[PDB]
Symmetry: T
Subunit: 64 residues, 12 copies
Amino acid sequence: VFKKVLLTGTSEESFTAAADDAIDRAEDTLDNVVWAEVVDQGVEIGAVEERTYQTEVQVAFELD
Amino acid sequence: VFKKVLLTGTSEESFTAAADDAIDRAEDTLDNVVWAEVVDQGVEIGAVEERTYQTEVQVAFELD
Amino acid sequence: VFKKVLLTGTSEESFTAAADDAIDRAEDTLDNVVWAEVVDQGVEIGAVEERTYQTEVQVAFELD
Amino acid sequence: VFKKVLLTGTSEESFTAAADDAIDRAEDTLDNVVWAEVVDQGVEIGAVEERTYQTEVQVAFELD
Amino acid sequence: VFKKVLLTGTSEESFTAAADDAIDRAEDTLDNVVWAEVVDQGVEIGAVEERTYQTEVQVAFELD
Amino acid sequence: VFKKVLLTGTSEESFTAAADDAIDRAEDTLDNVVWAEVVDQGVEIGAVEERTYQTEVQVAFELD
Amino acid sequence: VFKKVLLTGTSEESFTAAADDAIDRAEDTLDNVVWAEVVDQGVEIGAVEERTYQTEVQVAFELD
Amino acid sequence: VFKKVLLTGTSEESFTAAADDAIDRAEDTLDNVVWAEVVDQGVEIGAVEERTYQTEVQVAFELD
Amino acid sequence: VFKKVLLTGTSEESFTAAADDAIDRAEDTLDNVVWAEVVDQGVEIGAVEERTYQTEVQVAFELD
Amino acid sequence: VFKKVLLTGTSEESFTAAADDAIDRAEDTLDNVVWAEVVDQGVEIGAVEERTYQTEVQVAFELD
Amino acid sequence: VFKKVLLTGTSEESFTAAADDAIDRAEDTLDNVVWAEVVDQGVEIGAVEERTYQTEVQVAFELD
Amino acid sequence: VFKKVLLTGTSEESFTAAADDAIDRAEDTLDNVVWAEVVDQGVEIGAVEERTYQTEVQVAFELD
Ligand SMILES: Cc1cc2nc3c(=O)[nH]c(=O)nc-3n(C[C@H](O)[C@H](O)[C@H](O)CO)c2cc1C
Ligand SMILES: Cc1cc2nc3c(=O)[nH]c(=O)nc-3n(C[C@H](O)[C@H](O)[C@H](O)CO)c2cc1C
Ligand SMILES: Cc1cc2nc3c(=O)[nH]c(=O)nc-3n(C[C@H](O)[C@H](O)[C@H](O)CO)c2cc1C
Ligand SMILES: Cc1cc2nc3c(=O)[nH]c(=O)nc-3n(C[C@H](O)[C@H](O)[C@H](O)CO)c2cc1C
Ligand SMILES: Cc1cc2nc3c(=O)[nH]c(=O)nc-3n(C[C@H](O)[C@H](O)[C@H](O)CO)c2cc1C
Ligand SMILES: Cc1cc2nc3c(=O)[nH]c(=O)nc-3n(C[C@H](O)[C@H](O)[C@H](O)CO)c2cc1C
Ligand SMILES: Cc1cc2nc3c(=O)[nH]c(=O)nc-3n(C[C@H](O)[C@H](O)[C@H](O)CO)c2cc1C
Ligand SMILES: Cc1cc2nc3c(=O)[nH]c(=O)nc-3n(C[C@H](O)[C@H](O)[C@H](O)CO)c2cc1C
Ligand SMILES: Cc1cc2nc3c(=O)[nH]c(=O)nc-3n(C[C@H](O)[C@H](O)[C@H](O)CO)c2cc1C
Ligand SMILES: Cc1cc2nc3c(=O)[nH]c(=O)nc-3n(C[C@H](O)[C@H](O)[C@H](O)CO)c2cc1C
Ligand SMILES: Cc1cc2nc3c(=O)[nH]c(=O)nc-3n(C[C@H](O)[C@H](O)[C@H](O)CO)c2cc1C
Ligand SMILES: Cc1cc2nc3c(=O)[nH]c(=O)nc-3n(C[C@H](O)[C@H](O)[C@H](O)CO)c2cc1C
Ligand SMILES: [Cl-]
Ligand SMILES: [Cl-]
Ligand SMILES: [Cl-]
Ligand SMILES: [Cl-]
Ligand SMILES: [Mg+2]
Ligand SMILES: [Mg+2]
Ligand SMILES: [Mg+2]
Ligand SMILES: [Mg+2]
Ligand SMILES: [Mg+2]
Ligand SMILES: [Mg+2]
Ligand SMILES: [Mg+2]
Ligand SMILES: [Mg+2]
Ligand SMILES: [Mg+2]
Ligand SMILES: [Mg+2]
Ligand SMILES: [Mg+2]
Ligand SMILES: [Mg+2]
Ligand SMILES: [Mg+2]
Ligand SMILES: [Mg+2]
Ligand SMILES: [Mg+2]
Ligand SMILES: [Mg+2]
Ligand SMILES: [Mg+2]
Ligand SMILES: [Mg+2]
Ligand SMILES: [Mg+2]
Ligand SMILES: [Mg+2]
Ligand SMILES: [Mg+2]
Ligand SMILES: [Mg+2]
Ligand SMILES: [Mg+2]
Ligand SMILES: [Mg+2]
Ligand code: NA
Ligand code: NA
Ligand code: NA
Ligand code: NA
């Protein structure tokens, strides 16, 4: 059985790096992280000093 | 990093109050609840005494 | 077996009341109305005296 | 010909009132506003004192 | 309030049995599992000895 | 001209058998049933003794 | 209250004429037909002598 | 950079002519109109003397 | 078994004729073309002398 | 690089067996078939002696 | 009230840089640009010397 | 007439480079490659030494 958690990563550099940010967090806390699916991308502009790229991913991990 | 939990709130009054019901529950258990996105709405009719409005939300919270 | 009918309710007050308007009509004519799923919402503005909220629902009823 | 503008209204009270907030703004600036279609709903939680309901609408107006 | 978890069940027999595999896991760990909604189906072919059917479900459970 | 009715079939055995349950009902009441399209699948768990698979279909029939 | 019926019209000439074919049928049988929304288009090729254009519409009519 | 405007064209003749009606309007007011994408089609029936076909398009134009 | 190919037909006349253009091409090269499903429509404007209607279809053909 | 082909399998028994029918065909003709994603399911009723279940899959295979 | 404009940015380098190109244009002409949502990505290949990445964004700005 | 092939490119560097990987393959084998549309993005994590970014594209090429 796989389970997915819905995470939004952020980066001041790129959408790829924002996806990595989410996956990094998942790997900090979860065992057996196997894949991620991108479900949304966006950019935070008018509440931050530097534009912040965001990539939202379903991160899948194998249970047990 | 943000994480989302997929919650269905209920209310005998309105779709807005049903969204609040879910958000209330998220705030009981989670720190740093930041926003919610409505993903579905519905009404339970033939198993309840009063119609029950339901609003399903992705509730986003900031990790750490 | 459940069957759904696709109804648009209207209200001069709210999207919740517009959903109720559709469900009310379904219950006038159908037995065993069990639930409704919201599939669209809108507002009629420039053909009415008062703005009219509309909520379109699939209203499910149990056959037999 | 109709044209649509994509507006997000806000309210501290309800999703209906948030839709009205967008439509109100459209009517301030545009002639011949005819209808609105709801395309998203959400709630701002962790940057505001009171939860703020948001309803995003395509607001249609007749050209000429 | 209902909460949903996004689980992918697997089976070497059928899509139905794969849905059951996910639901079985949810019932092992959660109280008050009430329904599941199928959100994706697929088949693993070229990393397994036998084709493996997969059914991804949102499994809903009642909180409290 | 074809018309479609939106039916949810149920089965304690499989998603295929649940689709058949809906189609069976359509054929009881309608002439010239020609095809069905699956539009949703789900499982009822916590209100039934045995898990109940559900398959929702648009069932198309030829008018006249 | 509006209700919609899901009809597929056909024509050997065009997608517009196929939409009209469905609407024509709705007007034969229903009072107060108000609008139609196109939801699918297709072409039947290898079971007919002439290609047959099909347009599927939700046809809305006002109840009462 | 391209920008899109969301326009609904109308015609008493066809969906193609309705798309042209929107594009015609865009070309009256905008420079560098490059393409259009159809996003919806419909038919106005019970407020007009003749059925009116509607085609909604995103009309893209090049900025600068 | 059916297979589909994803083709975009073009026409200076209509969306119907653009669908036919794709189907014509499929029939030139494939045996047992059975149906087509429209998946997108658009108009090329600012790289052509005459507006060019486009209809993208999945064209289904029976294998063997 | 992976490539996908869009195949509809058929079976007089089940949606699972219909998916297998498509995958079987892909494996007859292609090397390195790795997975399939279900994209549609349906049932042929009024042109066949026995109901025929259909499962449409994107079948992915590794190039080279 | 927020309003969104639908812009396609381009870059010969990356999808991130293409999103920035659109946002840059929005900030040239609009006050109070707050966020962007990615709605499509693509690549222009056979009309340009170098591949051109494109990212289409809804760019949101606060009115007043 | 344009035809599209559905390709998934991979890269250990970025989603942009993964799109290029698919397009590169298309250009190796096909004449008149004109554009690509991104339809999915993902990351392979727990079967590879380095995370592998994937971008799935419909790659369009002009026939004849
Ligand atoms: C992808 C994305 C979507 C957003 N959507 C909204 C929104 O719908 N409403 C909102 O108030 N702020 C939204 N924001 C945040 C906004 O830019 C700003 O930080 C808030 O307005 C602060 O209250 C969004 C930010 C991002 C990156
Ligand atoms: C939005 C919504 C969707 C529902 N969908 C289903 C369904 O697909 N099948 C079902 O058995 N009950 C469904 N129900 C519950 C139904 O109204 C009733 O309580 C059940 O039939 C009890 O078994 C739904 C209820 C709501 C509020
Ligand atoms: C949600 C909604 C969508 C509508 N869409 C359309 C449309 O696409 N075309 C149209 O002519 N009128 C539309 N109308 C009706 C419009 O406001 C007006 O009453 C008509 O233009 C009368 O011919 C719509 C009304 C609502 C509430
Ligand atoms: C519907 C909605 C969606 C939002 N989405 C995002 C988002 O994707 N990323 C984000 O940083 N903030 C988002 N926000 C704003 C968030 O709540 C907070 O104000 C920001 O994090 C401030 O930077 C959203 C707010 C709303 C109401
Ligand atoms: C429904 C489904 C979707 C899949 N999608 C992908 C994918 O997008 N990329 C991938 O590398 N592997 C995918 N795989 C796994 C693939 O079959 C194989 O196990 C991997 O390529 C191993 O690295 C998928 C498997 C299934 C069952
Ligand atoms: C596919 C499916 C979806 C359902 N969705 C809901 C729902 O959204 N809300 C709800 O109260 N019950 C729902 N139910 C019914 C639920 O399992 C239980 O019978 C009800 O909670 C009884 O009130 C659903 C059942 C099925 C099979
Ligand atoms: C838009 C459209 C979709 C169709 N889809 C299917 C299908 O999924 N399976 C099928 O057997 N026939 C389908 N047909 C019918 C097909 O062309 C042929 O008449 C049947 O194969 C006869 O059994 C479709 C026809 C049209 C016009
Ligand atoms: C595509 C389309 C969609 C429409 N949707 C609606 C609607 O949702 N509600 C409505 O009141 N009128 C709608 N109308 C207008 C309707 O036919 C009639 O003109 C209005 O009811 C006048 O108030 C629509 C018209 C078209 C062409
Ligand atoms: C339906 C449709 C969609 C198009 N989308 C794009 C696009 O996203 N980007 C683009 O550069 N050109 C696009 N074009 C082509 C555009 O009109 C023009 O020919 C190109 O800009 C040439 O580089 C599109 C054309 C059509 C018909
Ligand atoms: C999933 C599915 C979808 C279909 N859709 C259509 C359709 O849209 N139009 C049609 O004429 N036949 C359709 N058919 C075929 C239909 O049942 C019958 O064989 C044809 O009407 C023969 O011309 C479909 C069959 C299946 C299995
Ligand atoms: C994302 C994207 C989508 C496009 N879609 C189309 C299309 O549907 N039809 C078309 O003629 N050109 C399209 N083009 C443009 C195409 O590559 C080429 O420039 C045109 O064919 C010039 O007429 C597209 C370009 C891009 C980047
Ligand atoms: C975007 C993406 C989606 C995937 N989906 C699945 C899946 O649904 N099931 C699966 O078994 N593996 C999937 N995989 C592959 C998975 O990470 C691992 O390689 C396989 O589990 C090997 O059997 C996917 C990989 C990617 C990159
Ligand atoms: Cl989710
Ligand atoms: Cl329907
Ligand atoms: Cl495809
Ligand atoms: Cl838009
Ligand atoms: Mg930096
Ligand atoms: Mg988002
Ligand atoms: Mg009360
Ligand atoms: Mg739901
Ligand atoms: Mg009042
Ligand atoms: Mg509507
Ligand atoms: Mg207040
Ligand atoms: Mg939104
Ligand atoms: Mg076995
Ligand atoms: Mg999946
Ligand atoms: Mg049994
Ligand atoms: Mg359902
Ligand atoms: Mg003729
Ligand atoms: Mg169809
Ligand atoms: Mg005329
Ligand atoms: Mg519309
Ligand atoms: Mg001509
Ligand atoms: Mg397209
Ligand atoms: Mg048999
Ligand atoms: Mg299909
Ligand atoms: Mg360069
Ligand atoms: Mg695009
Ligand atoms: Mg490297
Ligand atoms: Mg994918
Ligand atoms: Na989730
Ligand atoms: Na219906
Ligand atoms: Na817009
Ligand atoms: Na394809």
